[PDB]
Amino acid sequence: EVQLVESGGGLVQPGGSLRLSCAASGFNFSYYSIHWVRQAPGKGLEWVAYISSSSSYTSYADSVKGRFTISADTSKNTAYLQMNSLRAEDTAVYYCARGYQYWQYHASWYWNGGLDYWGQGTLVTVSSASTKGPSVFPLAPSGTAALGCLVKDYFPEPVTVSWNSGALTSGVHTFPAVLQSSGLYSLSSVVTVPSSSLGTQTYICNVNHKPSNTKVDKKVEPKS
Amino acid sequence: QRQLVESGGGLVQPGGSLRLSCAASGSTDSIEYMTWFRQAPGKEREGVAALYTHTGNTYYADSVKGRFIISRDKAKNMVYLQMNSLEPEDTAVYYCGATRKYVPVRFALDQSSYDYWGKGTPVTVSS
Amino acid sequence: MTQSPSSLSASVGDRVTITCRASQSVSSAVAWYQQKPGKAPKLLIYSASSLYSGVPSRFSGSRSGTDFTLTISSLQPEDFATYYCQQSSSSLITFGQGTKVEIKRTVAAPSVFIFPPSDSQLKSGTASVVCLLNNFYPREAKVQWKVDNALQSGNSQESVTEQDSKDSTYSLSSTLTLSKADYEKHKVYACEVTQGTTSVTKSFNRGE
């Protein structure tokens, strides 16, 4: 089965550089083209680049005309986006995706094969701010009880929350993090359960913050 | 420079028909199979129709039997794919591939048996 | 490329139609993709009208004059998403602005929860009070904080989840941020949620 796995995102100062990877598997890498499409936070899709390694065709959107270079390594089935001279406007989730090798040749009023498989995205954030890991305080429980976890003052995005290391899927709301006036991010994650269970059921929330290599596990008990 | 060139694709209503042509260069009697493959978004490139050059025997994928016809013209080194009764599931880029090393006929419809390929001609079958 | 319904709200079972106009004058067949909030977008229709493999039959595309349309014949709750059309000019691929698709449904009131600031957060000088609005519709709602019945301003922030995949309701949290100084100078902490013709207040007393 085919998959496109991405790596190399993160935070970088303005003007700095960074190189993303798109590691392909499950198909002959030569018979296809690889595209990079990015998404600024809460904005649309921007196509940006593609390569077909076996004919070393490359093309570039105007908005990243001279700063970005796409390349590929058929030996290891990987495409690269080398980005230089990074501005804040380049902050986005960066997706890679597969098309036909000769898509430009094929394009017409009646044909467009689109892009069929996509990678998961890797977030690159461009700022001067520095990496800070979150603090985690409980939202302790009071018919049905509601408890949670506050994830305060971290940078950069993202953070992932789970409950009972994935064993508690149902009734979970993890909210979009919000940017506070301190320039750090804050979000909350909450669960509802039977109030009939707080006496017996222990609830841990599992907060991962890969950009700072930190994961906090916190049970939430009822205040007395 | 040995190379292949498809042509003849377009858009077609279901039930309609279309005829693709592939033209080879170099010297053409060394080839021993000409075949048509097709590739659709998210799906593997699949053998549709192979032609053994030196006896004219043809081999068809079960999904195109009786609707499609692969034929030749040594006078021109042009192979053709008459496609009849087209249906939307035939929508794909259609490629022409050639080999000059002999492979046993059970492998005639296999992608791996073919050294070189055209860039393809697109076919869209849609209401 | 201008897609015309920039945003859109419709009920389950409805038939929905988004339009996409070619930008160039050399027409280019359109692909359409579905994207759920912060996930990789998924292909739906290619070559203007070809249904991508695996995509349910309720999706379809075609041309309308010199433009293209996408149609969901029977809108389903999992279908809330942003929908993008896609073109090729000449070695350039461009996407359209996107069309956001919201499910419409019957009114639902939230279950309101208020959470005091934790003891370990207070030890560090700041108090976060959080108000939770669970499983409501529609998403518009004035949530308001009160401290000894004094309305607050400029110290709150909200964020809502996206629609639940099976029942189409939102959830909201509002965090009131105070200094441990000011939190312990006051007693009654309340958050009020007004939806049309009702306001519901949940509160706690710092000496619980």
Coordinates of C-alpha atoms in Angstrom, one line a residue:
Chain A
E1 CA 0.0 0.0 0.0
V2 CA 1.2 3.5 -0.9
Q3 CA 2.2 6.1 1.6
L4 CA 3.9 9.5 1.6
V5 CA 5.7 10.3 4.9
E6 CA 7.0 13.8 5.7
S7 CA 9.7 15.1 8.0
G8 CA 11.8 18.1 8.6
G9 CA 9.3 20.7 9.7
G10 CA 9.7 22.9 12.7
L11 CA 10.5 26.4 13.8
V12 CA 13.1 28.6 12.2
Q13 CA 14.1 32.3 12.4
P14 CA 13.2 34.6 9.6
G15 CA 15.7 34.5 6.7
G16 CA 16.8 31.0 7.8
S17 CA 16.6 27.8 5.8
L18 CA 15.1 24.4 6.2
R19 CA 14.7 21.2 4.1
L20 CA 11.6 19.0 4.1
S21 CA 11.5 15.4 3.1
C22 CA 8.7 13.4 1.4
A23 CA 9.6 9.7 1.8
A24 CA 7.5 7.6 -0.6
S25 CA 6.7 3.9 -0.5
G26 CA 4.3 1.4 -2.1
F27 CA 4.9 2.3 -5.8
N28 CA 7.6 2.8 -8.3
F29 CA 8.8 6.3 -7.6
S30 CA 9.8 7.0 -11.2
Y31 CA 6.5 6.7 -12.9
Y32 CA 5.0 9.6 -10.9
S33 CA 5.5 13.2 -10.0
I34 CA 5.7 14.6 -6.4
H35 CA 4.1 18.0 -5.5
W36 CA 4.4 20.3 -2.5
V37 CA 1.3 22.2 -1.5
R38 CA 1.2 24.4 1.6
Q39 CA -1.5 26.0 3.8
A40 CA -1.1 29.1 5.8
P41 CA -3.0 29.0 9.1
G42 CA -6.7 29.3 8.3
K43 CA -6.1 29.9 4.6
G44 CA -6.5 28.0 1.4
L45 CA -4.2 25.6 -0.5
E46 CA -1.2 27.0 -2.3
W47 CA 0.4 24.8 -4.9
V48 CA 4.1 25.6 -4.8
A49 CA 6.4 23.0 -6.6
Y50 CA 6.7 19.6 -8.3
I51 CA 9.3 17.2 -9.6
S52 CA 9.3 14.1 -11.8
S53 CA 12.7 12.6 -11.0
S54 CA 12.9 10.2 -13.9
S55 CA 12.8 13.1 -16.4
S56 CA 14.0 15.7 -13.9
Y57 CA 11.2 18.0 -14.7
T58 CA 10.7 20.7 -12.0
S59 CA 8.4 23.7 -11.8
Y60 CA 7.8 26.4 -9.2
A61 CA 5.0 28.7 -8.2
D62 CA 5.8 32.4 -8.4
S63 CA 5.4 33.1 -4.7
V64 CA 8.5 31.0 -4.0
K65 CA 10.3 31.7 -7.3
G66 CA 13.9 32.0 -6.2
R67 CA 13.9 30.8 -2.6
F68 CA 12.7 27.2 -2.9
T69 CA 14.4 24.3 -4.6
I70 CA 12.8 20.9 -5.2
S71 CA 14.9 17.8 -5.8
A72 CA 14.6 14.1 -5.5
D73 CA 16.7 10.9 -4.7
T74 CA 15.3 8.0 -6.6
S75 CA 17.8 5.8 -4.7
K76 CA 15.9 6.4 -1.5
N77 CA 12.4 7.3 -3.0
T78 CA 12.4 10.7 -1.4
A79 CA 11.7 14.2 -2.6
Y80 CA 13.0 17.4 -0.9
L81 CA 11.9 20.9 -0.6
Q82 CA 14.9 23.1 0.3
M83 CA 13.5 26.5 1.5
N84 CA 15.8 29.5 1.8
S85 CA 15.2 33.1 2.9
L86 CA 12.2 32.1 5.0
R87 CA 9.6 34.8 5.8
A88 CA 6.7 34.8 8.2
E89 CA 4.5 34.4 5.0
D90 CA 6.0 31.0 4.6
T91 CA 4.5 29.7 7.9
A92 CA 2.3 26.8 6.9
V93 CA 1.5 23.2 7.0
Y94 CA 3.5 21.8 4.1
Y95 CA 1.9 18.8 2.3
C96 CA 3.4 16.6 -0.4
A97 CA 1.3 14.7 -2.9
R98 CA 1.5 12.4 -5.9
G99 CA 0.5 13.1 -9.5
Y100 CA 1.1 11.6 -12.9
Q101 CA 4.6 11.8 -14.2
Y102 CA 3.6 13.6 -17.4
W103 CA 0.7 15.6 -15.9
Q104 CA 1.7 18.8 -17.7
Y105 CA 1.8 16.9 -21.1
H106 CA -1.6 15.4 -20.4
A107 CA -3.4 18.5 -19.1
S108 CA -6.3 19.6 -21.4
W109 CA -9.9 20.8 -21.3
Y110 CA -11.1 17.2 -20.7
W111 CA -8.3 15.6 -18.7
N112 CA -6.9 16.4 -15.2
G113 CA -5.8 13.4 -13.1
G114 CA -5.4 15.5 -10.0
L115 CA -3.3 14.4 -7.0
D116 CA -4.4 11.1 -5.5
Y117 CA -2.3 10.4 -2.4
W118 CA -1.1 13.0 0.1
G119 CA 1.2 13.0 3.0
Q120 CA 0.2 14.0 6.6
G121 CA 1.6 17.5 6.5
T122 CA 4.5 19.0 8.5
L123 CA 4.2 22.4 10.2
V124 CA 6.9 24.9 9.6
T125 CA 6.6 28.0 11.7
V126 CA 8.8 31.0 11.0
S127 CA 9.4 33.4 14.0
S128 CA 11.9 34.9 16.3
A129 CA 10.1 33.5 19.4
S130 CA 11.8 30.5 21.2
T131 CA 10.6 27.0 22.1
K132 CA 8.8 26.7 25.4
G133 CA 7.0 23.5 26.7
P134 CA 3.6 23.7 28.2
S135 CA 2.3 23.6 31.8
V136 CA -0.6 21.2 32.5
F137 CA -3.1 22.0 35.2
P138 CA -6.2 19.8 35.8
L139 CA -9.8 20.9 35.3
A140 CA -11.1 18.9 38.2
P141 CA -14.6 17.3 38.2
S142 CA -17.6 18.4 40.2
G143 CA -25.8 13.2 36.4
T144 CA -22.6 13.2 34.3
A145 CA -19.3 14.7 35.3
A146 CA -17.0 16.8 33.1
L147 CA -13.2 17.0 33.7
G148 CA -10.3 18.2 31.6
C149 CA -6.7 19.5 31.3
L150 CA -5.5 23.0 30.7
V151 CA -2.4 23.2 28.5
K152 CA -1.0 26.7 29.0
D153 CA 1.9 28.8 27.7
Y154 CA 3.7 26.6 25.1
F155 CA 5.4 27.4 21.8
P156 CA 5.5 26.4 19.1
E157 CA 2.4 24.5 17.8
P158 CA 1.5 21.7 17.9
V159 CA 0.3 19.8 21.0
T160 CA -1.6 16.6 21.0
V161 CA -3.8 15.4 23.8
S162 CA -5.2 12.0 24.5
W163 CA -6.9 10.3 27.5
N164 CA -5.9 7.2 29.3
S165 CA -3.3 6.8 26.5
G166 CA -5.9 6.4 23.8
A167 CA -8.2 4.1 25.8
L168 CA -10.7 7.0 26.4
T169 CA -11.9 8.1 23.0
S170 CA -15.5 9.0 23.6
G171 CA -16.8 12.3 24.9
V172 CA -13.4 14.0 24.3
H173 CA -13.2 17.6 23.0
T174 CA -9.8 19.0 22.4
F175 CA -10.1 22.6 21.5
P176 CA -8.1 24.6 19.0
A177 CA -5.3 26.3 20.8
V178 CA -5.5 30.1 21.1
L179 CA -2.8 32.7 20.9
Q180 CA -2.5 34.7 24.1
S181 CA -1.1 38.2 24.3
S182 CA 2.1 36.7 25.7
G183 CA 2.7 35.2 22.3
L184 CA 2.3 31.7 23.7
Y185 CA -0.4 29.2 23.0
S186 CA -3.1 27.8 25.3
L187 CA -5.7 25.1 24.8
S188 CA -7.9 22.8 26.9
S189 CA -9.0 19.2 26.5
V190 CA -12.1 18.0 28.3
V191 CA -14.1 14.8 28.8
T192 CA -17.5 13.9 30.2
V193 CA -18.1 10.6 32.0
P194 CA -20.6 9.0 34.4
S195 CA -20.4 10.8 37.8
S196 CA -20.9 7.1 38.8
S197 CA -17.3 6.5 37.8
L198 CA -15.1 9.1 39.5
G199 CA -14.8 7.0 42.6
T200 CA -13.4 4.0 40.7
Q201 CA -12.1 5.3 37.3
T202 CA -8.8 7.1 37.2
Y203 CA -8.4 9.6 34.3
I204 CA -5.0 10.6 33.0
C205 CA -4.6 13.1 30.2
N206 CA -1.5 12.6 28.0
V207 CA -0.1 15.8 26.6
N208 CA 2.6 15.5 23.9
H209 CA 4.7 18.5 22.8
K210 CA 7.1 17.2 20.2
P211 CA 8.6 20.6 19.3
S212 CA 10.2 20.6 22.8
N213 CA 10.5 16.8 23.3
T214 CA 8.2 16.9 26.3
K215 CA 5.2 14.8 27.3
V216 CA 3.2 15.4 30.5
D217 CA 0.9 12.8 31.9
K218 CA -1.5 14.2 34.6
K219 CA -4.3 12.4 36.4
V220 CA -7.3 14.5 37.2
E221 CA -9.0 13.6 40.5
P222 CA -12.1 15.3 42.1
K223 CA -11.4 18.1 44.5
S224 CA -12.8 17.6 48.0
Chain B
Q1 CA 16.6 7.5 -30.3
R2 CA 14.1 4.6 -29.7
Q3 CA 10.8 6.1 -28.5
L4 CA 7.1 5.7 -28.6
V5 CA 4.2 8.2 -29.2
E6 CA 0.5 7.7 -28.3
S7 CA -2.3 9.8 -29.7
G8 CA -6.1 9.7 -30.2
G9 CA -7.5 10.2 -26.8
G10 CA -10.3 12.5 -26.0
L11 CA -13.6 12.7 -24.1
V12 CA -16.4 10.2 -24.9
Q13 CA -19.9 9.5 -23.7
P14 CA -20.6 6.1 -22.3
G15 CA -21.2 3.6 -25.0
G16 CA -19.1 5.6 -27.5
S17 CA -15.8 4.5 -29.0
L18 CA -12.4 5.8 -29.8
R19 CA -9.2 4.7 -31.5
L20 CA -5.7 5.2 -30.2
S21 CA -2.5 5.0 -32.2
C22 CA 1.1 4.4 -31.1
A23 CA 4.1 5.0 -33.4
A24 CA 7.6 3.6 -32.8
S25 CA 11.0 4.8 -34.1
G26 CA 14.4 3.2 -34.3
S27 CA 14.3 -0.1 -36.1
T28 CA 11.1 -2.1 -35.4
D29 CA 11.5 -5.7 -36.3
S30 CA 13.6 -6.4 -33.2
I31 CA 10.6 -5.7 -31.0
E32 CA 8.6 -8.7 -30.0
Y33 CA 5.7 -7.2 -28.0
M34 CA 3.7 -4.1 -28.5
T35 CA 1.1 -3.6 -25.8
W36 CA -1.4 -1.1 -24.4
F37 CA -1.5 -0.3 -20.7
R38 CA -3.7 2.1 -18.9
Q39 CA -3.4 4.1 -15.6
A40 CA -6.2 5.8 -13.6
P41 CA -5.9 8.0 -10.5
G42 CA -5.1 5.9 -7.5
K43 CA -4.8 2.7 -9.4
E44 CA -2.0 0.5 -10.8
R45 CA -1.0 0.7 -14.4
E46 CA -2.8 -2.4 -15.9
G47 CA -2.1 -4.4 -19.1
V48 CA -5.0 -4.1 -21.5
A49 CA -3.9 -5.7 -24.8
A50 CA -0.6 -7.3 -26.0
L51 CA 0.5 -8.1 -29.5
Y52 CA 3.2 -10.6 -30.3
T53 CA 4.9 -9.0 -33.2
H54 CA 6.1 -12.0 -35.1
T55 CA 2.9 -14.1 -35.1
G56 CA 0.4 -11.4 -34.5
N57 CA -1.1 -13.2 -31.5
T58 CA -3.1 -10.9 -29.2
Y59 CA -3.8 -11.1 -25.5
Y60 CA -6.6 -9.3 -23.7
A61 CA -7.3 -8.4 -20.1
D62 CA -10.7 -9.9 -19.1
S63 CA -12.0 -6.4 -18.5
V64 CA -11.7 -5.4 -22.1
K65 CA -12.4 -8.6 -24.0
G66 CA -14.4 -8.1 -27.1
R67 CA -14.7 -4.4 -26.7
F68 CA -11.0 -3.6 -27.5
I69 CA -8.8 -4.6 -30.4
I70 CA -5.1 -4.2 -30.7
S71 CA -3.7 -4.4 -34.3
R72 CA -0.6 -3.4 -36.3
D73 CA 0.7 -2.1 -39.6
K74 CA 4.3 -3.1 -40.3
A75 CA 4.2 -0.9 -43.4
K76 CA 4.2 2.0 -40.8
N77 CA 5.2 0.5 -37.4
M78 CA 1.9 1.8 -36.0
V79 CA -0.1 -0.2 -33.4
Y80 CA -3.7 0.7 -32.8
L81 CA -6.2 0.2 -30.0
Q82 CA -9.8 0.2 -31.2
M83 CA -11.9 0.9 -28.1
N84 CA -15.6 0.1 -28.4
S85 CA -18.5 0.4 -25.9
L86 CA -16.5 2.7 -23.7
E87 CA -17.7 3.1 -20.1
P88 CA -16.6 5.4 -17.3
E89 CA -14.5 2.8 -15.6
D90 CA -12.3 2.9 -18.8
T91 CA -11.3 6.5 -17.9
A92 CA -7.5 6.6 -17.7
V93 CA -4.2 7.6 -19.3
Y94 CA -3.5 5.1 -22.1
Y95 CA 0.1 4.1 -22.6
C96 CA 1.9 2.1 -25.3
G97 CA 4.9 0.0 -24.3
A98 CA 7.5 -2.0 -26.3
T99 CA 9.9 -4.8 -25.5
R100 CA 12.5 -6.4 -27.7
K101 CA 13.6 -9.2 -25.3
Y102 CA 11.4 -12.2 -25.5
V103 CA 9.2 -13.0 -22.4
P104 CA 6.8 -16.0 -22.1
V105 CA 3.3 -15.0 -23.2
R106 CA 1.8 -15.4 -19.7
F107 CA 3.8 -12.3 -18.8
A108 CA 2.7 -10.3 -21.9
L109 CA 0.2 -8.1 -19.9
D110 CA 2.7 -7.4 -17.1
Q111 CA 4.1 -3.9 -16.5
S112 CA 7.5 -5.3 -15.6
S113 CA 8.0 -7.0 -19.0
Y114 CA 8.4 -3.7 -21.0
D115 CA 11.6 -1.7 -21.3
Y116 CA 10.2 1.5 -22.8
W117 CA 7.0 3.5 -22.8
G118 CA 5.3 6.5 -24.4
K119 CA 4.1 9.5 -22.3
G120 CA 0.5 8.4 -22.7
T121 CA -2.7 9.8 -24.2
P122 CA -5.6 10.6 -21.9
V123 CA -9.1 9.1 -22.2
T124 CA -12.1 10.5 -20.3
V125 CA -15.4 8.6 -20.6
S126 CA -18.2 10.5 -19.0
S127 CA -21.9 11.5 -19.3
Chain C
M1 CA -9.9 30.9 -9.1
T2 CA -13.2 32.1 -7.6
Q3 CA -15.4 29.4 -6.2
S4 CA -18.7 31.0 -5.8
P5 CA -20.4 29.9 -2.5
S6 CA -17.5 30.9 -0.3
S7 CA -19.3 29.3 2.6
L8 CA -22.4 27.4 2.9
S9 CA -24.9 25.9 5.4
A10 CA -27.4 23.2 4.5
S11 CA -29.3 20.3 6.1
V12 CA -28.7 16.6 6.0
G13 CA -30.1 15.0 2.9
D14 CA -30.0 18.3 1.0
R15 CA -28.4 18.6 -2.5
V16 CA -25.5 21.1 -2.6
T17 CA -23.8 22.7 -5.5
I18 CA -20.5 24.6 -5.6
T19 CA -19.3 26.4 -8.7
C20 CA -15.7 27.0 -9.9
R21 CA -14.7 29.3 -12.7
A22 CA -11.7 28.8 -14.9
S23 CA -9.2 31.7 -14.5
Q24 CA -7.3 31.5 -17.8
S25 CA -9.0 31.5 -21.2
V26 CA -7.4 28.1 -22.1
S27 CA -9.9 25.8 -20.3
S28 CA -8.5 23.2 -18.0
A29 CA -10.5 20.3 -16.6
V30 CA -11.0 20.6 -12.9
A31 CA -10.2 18.4 -10.0
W32 CA -12.1 18.7 -6.7
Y33 CA -10.9 17.8 -3.2
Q34 CA -12.4 17.5 0.3
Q35 CA -10.4 18.8 3.3
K36 CA -11.4 18.4 6.9
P37 CA -10.0 20.8 9.5
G38 CA -6.2 20.5 9.5
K39 CA -6.1 17.2 7.8
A40 CA -4.6 16.3 4.4
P41 CA -7.2 17.0 1.7
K42 CA -8.7 14.0 -0.2
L43 CA -9.4 13.8 -4.0
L44 CA -13.0 13.4 -5.0
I45 CA -13.6 14.2 -8.7
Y46 CA -11.0 14.4 -11.4
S47 CA -11.1 15.2 -15.1
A48 CA -14.2 17.4 -14.4
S49 CA -16.6 14.5 -13.9
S50 CA -14.8 11.3 -13.0
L51 CA -15.5 9.9 -9.6
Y52 CA -12.2 9.0 -7.9
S53 CA -12.0 5.4 -6.7
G54 CA -13.5 4.8 -3.2
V55 CA -15.4 8.1 -3.1
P56 CA -19.1 7.6 -2.4
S57 CA -21.5 8.0 -5.3
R58 CA -23.3 11.0 -3.7
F59 CA -20.4 13.2 -5.1
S60 CA -20.4 14.2 -8.7
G61 CA -18.9 16.9 -11.0
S62 CA -19.7 18.3 -14.3
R63 CA -19.6 21.5 -16.4
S64 CA -22.0 24.4 -16.4
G65 CA -21.3 26.5 -19.5
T66 CA -17.7 27.5 -19.3
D67 CA -17.4 26.7 -15.5
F68 CA -17.5 23.6 -13.4
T69 CA -19.7 22.4 -10.5
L70 CA -19.4 19.9 -7.6
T71 CA -22.6 18.3 -6.3
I72 CA -23.3 16.3 -3.2
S73 CA -26.7 14.7 -4.0
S74 CA -27.6 13.9 -0.4
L75 CA -25.7 15.9 2.2
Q76 CA -24.5 13.8 5.0
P77 CA -23.2 14.7 8.5
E78 CA -19.6 13.6 7.8
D79 CA -19.5 16.0 4.8
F80 CA -18.7 19.2 6.6
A81 CA -15.4 20.3 5.1
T82 CA -13.7 22.9 2.9
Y83 CA -13.9 21.9 -0.8
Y84 CA -11.3 23.0 -3.3
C85 CA -11.2 23.0 -7.1
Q86 CA -8.0 22.6 -8.9
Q87 CA -6.5 23.5 -12.3
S88 CA -3.4 23.4 -14.4
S89 CA -2.4 26.3 -16.5
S90 CA 1.0 25.6 -18.1
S91 CA 3.3 23.8 -15.6
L92 CA 1.5 25.8 -12.9
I93 CA -1.2 24.2 -10.7
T94 CA -3.6 26.5 -8.9
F95 CA -6.3 25.8 -6.4
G96 CA -9.4 27.9 -5.8
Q97 CA -10.3 29.9 -2.7
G98 CA -12.2 27.0 -1.1
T99 CA -15.8 26.6 -0.1
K100 CA -16.7 25.9 3.6
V101 CA -19.6 23.5 4.1
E102 CA -21.5 23.5 7.4
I103 CA -24.3 21.2 8.3
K104 CA -27.6 22.8 9.4
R105 CA -29.7 21.1 12.1
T106 CA -32.1 21.7 15.0
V107 CA -31.2 23.9 17.9
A108 CA -29.5 22.3 20.8
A109 CA -28.6 23.8 24.2
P110 CA -25.2 23.3 25.8
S111 CA -24.4 21.7 29.0
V112 CA -22.5 24.4 30.8
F113 CA -19.6 23.6 33.2
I114 CA -17.4 26.0 35.1
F115 CA -13.9 25.0 36.4
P116 CA -12.1 26.9 39.2
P117 CA -8.4 27.5 38.7
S118 CA -6.3 24.7 40.0
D119 CA -4.2 24.9 43.2
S120 CA -0.9 24.3 41.3
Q121 CA -1.6 27.0 38.7
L122 CA -2.4 29.5 41.5
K123 CA 1.0 28.8 43.1
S124 CA 2.6 30.5 40.1
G125 CA 0.7 33.8 40.2
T126 CA -2.0 33.5 37.6
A127 CA -5.7 32.2 37.6
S128 CA -7.3 30.6 34.5
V129 CA -11.1 30.1 34.9
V130 CA -12.6 28.0 32.1
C131 CA -16.2 27.8 31.0
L132 CA -17.3 24.8 28.9
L133 CA -20.2 24.7 26.5
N134 CA -20.8 21.1 25.4
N135 CA -22.6 19.8 22.3
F136 CA -24.7 22.8 21.2
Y137 CA -26.0 24.3 17.9
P138 CA -25.9 26.8 16.4
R139 CA -22.3 27.9 17.2
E140 CA -23.2 31.6 17.8
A141 CA -23.6 32.3 21.5
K142 CA -22.5 35.2 23.7
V143 CA -20.6 33.7 26.6
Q144 CA -19.9 36.3 29.3
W145 CA -17.9 36.3 32.5
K146 CA -18.9 37.9 35.8
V147 CA -16.9 38.4 39.0
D148 CA -19.0 39.5 41.9
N149 CA -21.6 40.3 39.2
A150 CA -19.1 42.6 37.4
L151 CA -19.1 42.0 33.6
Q152 CA -15.6 41.4 32.2
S153 CA -13.9 42.8 29.0
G154 CA -10.8 42.0 27.1
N155 CA -9.5 39.2 29.5
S156 CA -11.4 36.3 27.9
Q157 CA -10.7 34.1 24.9
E158 CA -12.8 31.4 23.2
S159 CA -12.3 28.5 20.8
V160 CA -14.9 26.1 19.3
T161 CA -14.3 22.6 18.0
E162 CA -15.6 21.8 14.6
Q163 CA -18.9 20.0 14.1
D164 CA -19.3 16.6 15.6
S165 CA -19.2 14.0 12.8
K166 CA -22.5 12.3 13.7
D167 CA -24.7 14.9 15.5
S168 CA -23.3 18.2 14.0
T169 CA -23.0 20.1 17.4
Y170 CA -20.2 22.4 18.5
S171 CA -18.3 22.7 21.8
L172 CA -16.9 25.9 23.2
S173 CA -14.5 26.9 25.9
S174 CA -14.0 30.4 27.2
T175 CA -10.9 31.1 29.5
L176 CA -10.9 34.0 31.8
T177 CA -7.4 35.0 32.7
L178 CA -6.7 36.8 36.1
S179 CA -3.8 37.3 38.4
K180 CA -3.8 35.3 41.6
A181 CA -3.9 38.7 43.2
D182 CA -7.3 39.6 41.6
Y183 CA -8.7 36.1 41.8
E184 CA -8.4 36.0 45.6
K185 CA -9.9 39.6 46.0
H186 CA -13.3 38.3 44.8
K187 CA -15.8 35.6 45.6
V188 CA -18.4 34.7 43.0
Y189 CA -17.2 33.5 39.6
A190 CA -19.8 33.0 36.9
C191 CA -20.0 32.5 33.2
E192 CA -23.3 33.2 31.4
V193 CA -24.3 31.8 28.0
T194 CA -27.1 33.5 26.1
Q195 CA -28.6 31.7 23.1
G196 CA -31.6 33.5 21.7
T197 CA -34.4 33.4 24.3
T198 CA -32.5 31.9 27.3
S199 CA -29.4 32.7 29.4
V200 CA -27.9 30.0 31.6
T201 CA -25.4 30.8 34.3
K202 CA -23.0 28.5 36.1
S203 CA -21.0 29.8 39.0
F204 CA -18.8 28.8 41.9
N205 CA -17.7 30.4 45.2
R206 CA -13.9 30.6 45.8
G207 CA -14.5 29.1 49.2
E208 CA -16.2 26.0 47.8

